[PDB]
Design a protein around this ligand. Structure first.
Ligand SMILES: CC(C)(COP(=O)(O)OP(=O)(O)OC[C@H]1O[C@@H](n2cnc3c(N)ncnc32)[C@H](O)[C@@H]1OP(=O)(O)O)[C@@H](O)C(=O)NCCC(=O)NCCS
Ligand SMILES: CC(C)(COP(=O)(O)OP(=O)(O)OC[C@H]1O[C@@H](n2cnc3c(N)ncnc32)[C@H](O)[C@@H]1OP(=O)(O)O)[C@@H](O)C(=O)NCCC(=O)NCCS
Lengths: 402, 402
């Protein structure tokens, strides 16, 4: 398939089947970095992402679009012929849906013994009858993993937003597939990967849950965006708006207490010499620290706080709104936001390729493809004749460019 | 270094320098999957994660601990000797701190031309004077990327929790390093990677921001954990507690409207045949949909809703609290939560290895190492004599087991 040679993953061949965020995010990250990535959509209906007015121009860029019925007769045979030249296949389904329909890992490996197979599901490839075959999106994974219950304000839990669990799961899939690919080079045999979304989010939520699993108590939710345990950490108000700060480190704590009028607290049983963190609940002075911190901050503008905190090596930042991003000097300097052309010939704006590879930078070479756009090209490249593909379209088993 | 042979990354050698979550998360994910991973801590002070009572038993398991002054005299030489046998080096610093201290990418490559170098920072390896050298933690990256402003309730923004941006950044580092490693096999030359935390989070926050960058408006924050745009999506109340649901799909919408008493709305200008999603703001019936949905749900128990939604292929789940996780049948069946022994000989409980590799499963083989534990072993393995290492300890340039 015609495309430029770029990035660390040039020459790698990736195929994915899945809709919305998680599966396709995993697949498309390969394309950001140079790989040849085929997006499989069903024949009768298209990916549900196409209902979003602008996002798909970013989340589906650099992709080739195949539209094929991968489970039915000649569609199935065509799909399995494609697998012979495929290095990595990402699939997102309700549990072991592929195996249930006859496309097992053993069947796939009969066509390509080196193939890396990544199964993404809500609840895993096996477990109980009750959960294994259930559909899942982001919020389902947050609910089932204890992540949702940790987010929100004290009295009101809420999901992390937007679609946080989908990105973590997709990213985990990408990472695991690349790890397995490394093993194929060193062993010459394929791998199968079982990524359950709830297990991904369970790991991302352990910072305080590890206390519960090991004798302790679970932490509360944040109060108005302040860390539930550590004073001087999270969201604060200055005289002219919101900032964030992290009061961490021996020196930072000593100079900040001095600033806020609390120098006498240094060297007490719960804040002894060398204290790197002040625990707002274990220390009797916790609420007092917050009271004086709040009052000192309300006396200063964001700019003044930034300068003093720059002097103390205290991490902080103004909370930026979306309209403030484009013209930020750091964004401009690094080209964090760029422009590209859509397939239809319109100018689209959005984030550039991330991260920055020094020797082999990624690039945007293609806008989001249309439904069935590359079908005729992909099938011809795997041995199908013009009339033979015409029969796949007529039988309802494949769709070509509109 | 003595360790079992397991996982897709057996025989890979990884070194990381960084503290807390992001850097070490990237490094330790290699160790979950079989790699030999060296954790570098400073000599005079240890990783700040050690202040957490339980989490480090999970986040630092499977690791070898080196304690060395990588920038000073014989410590520097020892570090650069280690790099000769290292495949991947992860470093987390304030901007280009390594280069500023004399350890440039060109210097590193003089010792190992195939080395993959991953630089993790808040604001990148280059940019403006104002931002590039600033310290960063999770909340700083959320603030600077527009992620924080999207999380929380309508009237109250708040960070995603816990330390969400740290895990995304660490995971991106792992993925990029593995992608670059693939290129080294196919080109025989090293790579340098510039991962700025704010650019990572900028990408994770695009779902609705793409509308703003392309003519449209930015969405509001969620109201009590309901999707800002799409009805039937997010957090709801049943008669006996919180659930989450995603009302997505042609069939799901038709049968659910029928259930809630809104069948007559189907086939109207804004809900025409084939509608996969109901937009709560573009549709005049949006608030009515929510009103009837809320009332129908309040009539039913969680269990009843689950059964009916299982009949309709509508994704949903009870919102689980932390105490409900251990004894959940899916968690038990898959061993999602397991037990292991610490270095001190105590039983520790927490998440198992994720994800599940079929042919080469990861395993927990070592608990979290002590400060300086493997120093003498690592230095001896790179050509240092017992007396020569004794001088590194005495000069304050290295620390050995306590
Ligand atoms: C997202 C999800 C709920 C959607 O599933 P769905 O409601 O059944 O909708 P789909 O369009 O994917 O599936 C319809 C059917 O077509 C099949 N199908 C999918 N792609 C096909 C193709 N290219 N050709 C022929 N059939 C196809 C599916 O297998 C499914 O049949 P099944 O019930 O036997 O498994 C589900 O795929 C899932 O839980 N995935 C795992 C988690 C995930 O990825 N979530 C999305 C994160 S945003
Ligand atoms: C986390 C962070 C704020 C801490 O930085 P810090 O306050 O300077 O604390 P450190 O202990 O890391 O650094 C102290 C000094 O020791 C140096 N140092 C670090 N490891 C060393 C080692 N093994 N031997 C000798 N010196 C070392 C550092 O370079 C630094 O000196 P510098 O100012 O010239 O750069 C910073 O590393 C950072 O912004 N990292 C990038 C983003 C990130 O990883 N955040 C953490 C996510 S939880």
């Amino acid at each position: 398939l015609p495309m430029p040679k770029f990035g660390p993953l040039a020459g790698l061949r990736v195929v994915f089947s899945g809709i919305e965020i998680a599966g396709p995010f995993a697949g498309q990250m390969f394309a950001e970095w140079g790989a040849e990535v085929i997006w499989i959509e069903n024949v009768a209906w298209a990916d549900t992402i196409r209902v979003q007015p602008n996002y798909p121009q970013l989340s589906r860029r650099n992709l080739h679009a195949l539209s094929l019925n991968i489970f039915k007769d000649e569609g199935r045979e065509a799909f399995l012929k494609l697998m012979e030249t495929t290095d990595i296949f990402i699939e997102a389904s309700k549990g072991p849906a592929f195996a249930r329909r006859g496309i097992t890992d053993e069947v796939l490996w009969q066509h390509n013994p080196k193939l890396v197979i990544a199964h993404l599901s809500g609840f895993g490839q096996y477990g109980t009858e009750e959960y294994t075959n259930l559909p899942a999106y982001n919020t389902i994974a947050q609910a089932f993993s204890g992540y949702l219950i940790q987010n929100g304000d004290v009295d009101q839990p809420m999901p992390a937003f937007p679609y946080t669990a989908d990105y973590f799961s997709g990213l985990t899939a990408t990472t695991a597939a690349l790890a397995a690919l490394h093993k194929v080079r060193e062993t010459g045999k394929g791998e199968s990967i079982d990524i359950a979304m709830y297990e991904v989010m369970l790991r991302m939520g352990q910072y305080f849950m590890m206390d519960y699993f090991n004798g302790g108590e679970m932490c509360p939710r944040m109060s108005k965006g302040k860390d539930p345990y550590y004073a001087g950490c999270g969201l604060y108000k200055c005289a002219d708006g919101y900032i964030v700060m992290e009061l961490v480190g021996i020196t930072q704590i000593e100079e900040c207490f001095k600033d806020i009028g609390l120098a006498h607290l240094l060297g007490t049983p719960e804040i002894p010499e060398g204290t790197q963190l002040i625990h707002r609940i274990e220390c009797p002075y916790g609420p007092l620290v917050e009271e004086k911190l709040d009052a000192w901050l309300a006396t200063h503008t964001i700019a003044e706080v930034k300068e003093r905190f720059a002097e103390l090596n205290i991490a902080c930042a103004k909370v930026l709104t979306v309209p403030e991003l484009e013209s930020n000097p750091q964004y401009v300097a690094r080209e964090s936001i760029t422009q590209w052309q859509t397939m239809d010939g319109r100018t689209c704006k959005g984030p550039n390729i991330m991260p920055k590879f020094k020797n082999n930078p990624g690039q945007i070479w293609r806008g989001m493809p249309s439904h069935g756009m590359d079908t005729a090209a992909i099938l011809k490249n795997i041995g199908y004749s013009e009339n033979d593909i015409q029969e796949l379209v007529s039988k309802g088993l494949a769709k070509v460019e509109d």
